[PDB]
Amino acid sequence: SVIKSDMKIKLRMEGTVNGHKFVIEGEGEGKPYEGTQTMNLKVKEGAPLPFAYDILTTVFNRVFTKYPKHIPDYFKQSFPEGYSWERSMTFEDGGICTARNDITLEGDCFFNEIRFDGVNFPPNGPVMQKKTLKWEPSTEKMYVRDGVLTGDINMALLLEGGGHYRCDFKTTYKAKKGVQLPDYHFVDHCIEILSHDKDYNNVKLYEHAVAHSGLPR
Amino acid sequence: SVIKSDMKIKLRMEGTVNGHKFVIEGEGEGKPYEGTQTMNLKVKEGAPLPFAYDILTTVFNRVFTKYPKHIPDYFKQSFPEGYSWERSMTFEDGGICTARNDITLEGDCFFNEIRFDGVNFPPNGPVMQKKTLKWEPSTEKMYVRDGVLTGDINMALLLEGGGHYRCDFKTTYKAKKGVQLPDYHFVDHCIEILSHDKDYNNVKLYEHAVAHSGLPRQ
Amino acid sequence: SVIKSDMKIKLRMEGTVNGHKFVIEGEGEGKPYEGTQTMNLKVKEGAPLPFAYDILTTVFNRVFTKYPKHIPDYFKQSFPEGYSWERSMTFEDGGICTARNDITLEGDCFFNEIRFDGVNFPPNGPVMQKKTLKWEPSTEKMYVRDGVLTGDINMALLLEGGGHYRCDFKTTYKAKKGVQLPDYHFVDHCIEILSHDKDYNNVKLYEHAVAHSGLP
Amino acid sequence: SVIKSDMKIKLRMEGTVNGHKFVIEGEGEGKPYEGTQTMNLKVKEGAPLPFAYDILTTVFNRVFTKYPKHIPDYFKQSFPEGYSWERSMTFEDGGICTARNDITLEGDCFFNEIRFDGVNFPPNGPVMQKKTLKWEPSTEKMYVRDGVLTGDINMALLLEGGGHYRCDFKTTYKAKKGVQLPDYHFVDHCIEILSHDKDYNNVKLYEHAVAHSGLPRQ
């Protein structure tokens, strides 16, 4: 209700991947009730990035999810006070990332204070060799664990040359105040880089997300 | 084509869980094109089972999946020759199961030769203390690796008291002949014990499964 | 003690790997207090095995461990009644094996009833392509968890052509009767195939194992 | 050779655990050829830390390892140019840390630029409730992986109540210049908090580490 049909987004990511430091800023907008957002992202420090940009994109806000009425919306309920999230990204070849986002709201704009760290990517792996094409669509499994909303995802990057590179996500979402906790449910996702320049200094990103209860009997 | 709108199922599972031996036999029926099936299961050896019956139920055939026309159906294409599958179940508390099913077709009936082995369940955990209620519905991520089909699933058992117990599935599906391989896709599942006696010596089991391509950009 | 300086071993393993059924029988001897044992293994069903024999060898008894007096010996204390163990083997490429051994003692001979099952080995990986040379030596981390003794190991197979192939072991060891529980400790291992014929239908296997408390 | 019998250590860690930001500074000394070191650590920002100090201590340099003549010493050979390492810590309850250290040498002093980040610790788990007593001793398995020297460790925190809380370490070690790589080998460790104040704002830390070849063949 402080959550309007149209909202703005501003973000700052600082991070390190296999020792390479960088800073990326973003500005965009979205439709919280349609579960859509688009952002323009600019590398401010650390160009040219030496790793696959796709590892960053799901870190660049579950407010942008179409929740049906019968599933409590943890994220929209969190505002105006907001929420933070932490995530582990466990890639099948030993690469591990940690990420976090503290999300605040000022007027019609979400502010996103992000940290991203990646370690142990193999040097001839698809991330350091920039072999990724896109994330496949996914279904996130949302459940409450010790009062903490948790999402687990089987994620996969499609590779140049045709196979997949798997990553397991675990995100913990924490509202700053008391909200109605949902029961077990799902969030479907599609995320796409709509356009980019050669070194990904400039990227236009899109996400669509929809919450649901899964297949009925 | 040898796959009809209505088909029968016969099954035999032999296995162990934390060293406890058992044999379970099943007979049922299903609708391959509607992605539904029902089975009656009877414990033949090992009763009363000293572990949560729910760990077995997803081992009790992706033929019973509604596949849309634009996704190649790995499972239906494999018949009459058939297919086998192997699975690991990695529970969050260190319990690990291995399972396999070799699936043959005689006339209108699928035959299922199953092995199941579970190790390292904590003695006070929800499996050995029978504290599970059901599997939540799930979405399996299907993709080709090394010329065969892999499915990964984030599975969760609902527990007595309201929490969840997580398990990660990885299944390899292997056709006994060459089929049109599908691109990355999804299978949604719902599996339910419709009825059971107190010790789960007799169980009526139901599954619904539908394949799809996930959320579009639109 | 019923545990003598020299003891005999008989074993039967039944299992499946990638759907391939097999049975292997063994007979051997060892020195429980020296932490050594040797076994002759014969494939009885399922020859020739289509997978790396090395995945089986650590399934073919922690009785054969030199324990220093300051660490309770869970395994020797388990006899005469015996113990069982269960194991998961999580290979880095998704291959998973479950294994169990029910160990009894009749006179001077351990009997070993073994089940082994392996799934999800990639068809061109080192197990299905028989590209393994040996297990590296290891250190197992032993700790009591649910009143039950647990061992975790970072294992590695040396490969033909030079690399390693990693496997994580978790074993639970369960005495039939109450035994003194040890504090956290370590068991060092070395396992070797001493000799084998072309398709590993006949294998002579050796293990040395020594318990310790780690670096002071 | 630029590596002397007595060396000094200076470090700065910046990090976040559970969203809580902190900075810790360290000064110490050690005996690289004996595999020992001691450090004084002071929280500069973020006092009091709301999590178990023990999760930090192994991030506060394998130069401080007694290497026998028959195993190439990747770490001492990497100087004067130096080396970096990266680590993942996978705890058994889903807590995950990433850490890195860029190690330089100026005169007789190693300088350590450290980042540490921890996520998904359960609020009532032993790290957020500060229920850890110490790390157990450990044996690290060291091996080359596609040219990267890698260490894997089964680590365990002893807990209030007498159980253990397991963590799996994977560390990648990268020399700034080409160095002779070792064969598969082991490093034994013991790490101890010698003393601390009530909120661990001030900590004295000790490590002992010794490389070896494991049990001989034959």
C168: nearest CA in chain D?
D154
DSSP string for residues in A96-131 = EEEEEEEEEEETTEEEEEEEEEEE---TTSTTTTT-
CA B17 distance to own-chain centroid: 17
Write phi, then psi, for A51 (nearest 5 degrees). -130, 165
CB atoms closer than 10 angstroms to residue D111 = 16
Alpha helices (runs of H) in chain B, residue ranges in sequence order: 74-78
Which residue from D19, D94, D123 is facing A102, i.e. has the nearest CB?
A: D19
- Cβ-based neighbours of A180, under 8 Å, separated by 6 or more: A72, A74, A77
CB C5 within 8 A of CB C14: no
- Please report which helix (H) or strand (E) contains residue C75, including its range: helix C74-77
The answer to whether residue B18 is domain-embedded is yes
CB atoms closer than 10 angstroms to residue D206 = 17
Which residues is C179 bridged to in the sheet?
none
- The whole-angstrom separation of Cα A214 and Cα B15 is 31
Are C16 and B118 inside 8 Å of each other by CB? no
The verdict on whether omega for the bond into residue C137 sits within 30 degrees of 0, i.e. cis, is no
- The whole-angstrom separation of Cα C61 and Cα C105 is 12
- The whole-angstrom separation of Cα D40 and Cα D43 is 10
For B56, which DSSP code? G
- The whole-angstrom separation of Cα C60 and Cα C199 is 18
- The whole-angstrom separation of Cα B21 and Cα B38 is 25
The answer to whether residue A17 is domain-embedded is yes
Q: CA angle at residue D98 from A192 to D193, to 5 degrees?
A: 165
- The whole-angstrom separation of Cα C96 and Cα D103 is 38
The answer to whether residue A2 is domain-embedded is no
- As a whole number of angstroms, the longest Cα–Cα distance in chain A is 52
- Which amino acid belongs to residue B97? C
Q: Beta strand D20-31 with D185-196: parallel, antiparallel or unpaired? A: unpaired
- The whole-angstrom separation of Cα A202 and Cα A39 is 10
Are D119 and A87 inside 8 Å of each other by CB? yes
CB B95 within 8 A of CB B120: yes
The answer to whether residue C2 is domain-embedded is no
Residue C185, both tokens: 């400790």
The answer to whether residue A1 is domain-embedded is no
CB D117 within 8 A of CB D97: yes
Domain count, chain B: 1
CB D132 within 8 A of CB D143: no
Nearest C-alpha neighbor of B13 from the set B30, B25, B31: B25
- The whole-angstrom separation of Cα D116 and Cα D101 is 9
Residue B52, both tokens: 């949560």
Residue with tokens 């050995």: B128
Write phi, then psi, for B55 (nearest 5 degrees). -65, -20
- The whole-angstrom separation of Cα B119 and Cα D145 is 30
CA distance, residue C53 to nearest chain B CA (Å): 19
Are C100 and B119 inside 8 Å of each other by CB? yes
CA atoms lying within 13 Å on the CB side of residue C76: 22
Residue-range definition of the domain harbouring residue B79: 7-212
Write phi, then psi, for D198 (nearest 5 degrees). -55, -40
CB atoms closer than 10 angstroms to residue C48 = 11
- The whole-angstrom separation of Cα B22 and Cα B25 is 10
The answer to whether residue B217 is domain-embedded is no
- As a whole number of angstroms, the longest Cα–Cα distance in chain B is 53
Q: What is the CATH number of the domain that holds A16?
A: 2.40.155.10
Residue C169, both tokens: 């072991």
The verdict on whether omega for the bond into residue C32 sits within 30 degrees of 0, i.e. cis, is no
Residue with tokens 């049922």: B28
B216: nearest CA in chain A?
A190
Q: What is the resolution of this structure in A?
A: 1.5
Q: CA angle at residue C115 from C111 to C118, to 5 degrees?
A: 145
CA B204 distance to own-chain centroid: 14
The answer to whether residue D217 is domain-embedded is no
Chain pair C-D, CB pairs under 8 angstroms? 77
CB A44 within 8 A of CB A154: no
Helices and strands: H and E segment counts in chain B: 1, 12
DSSP string for residues in A151-171 = EEEEEEEEETTS-EEEEEEEE
- As a whole number of angstroms, the longest Cα–Cα distance in chain D is 55
Within 144-173 of C, beta carbons closer than 8 Å to D belong to 145, 152-154, 156, 158, 163-164, 166, 168
D175-179 contacts: CB < 8 A, separation 24 or more?
D175/D74, D175/D77, D175/D78, D175/D81, D175/D82, D175/D83, D176/D78, D176/D81, D176/D82, D176/D83, D176/D84, D177/D78, D177/D81, D179/D72, D179/D74, D179/D77, D179/D78
Residue B15, both tokens: 């296995």
The answer to whether residue B2 is domain-embedded is no
CB C56 within 8 A of CB C73: no
- The whole-angstrom separation of Cα A85 and Cα A58 is 12
Residue C22, both tokens: 């097999």
Per DSSP (E only), the strands in C32-108 are 36-45, 83-91, 96-106
Are A141 and B163 inside 8 Å of each other by CB? no
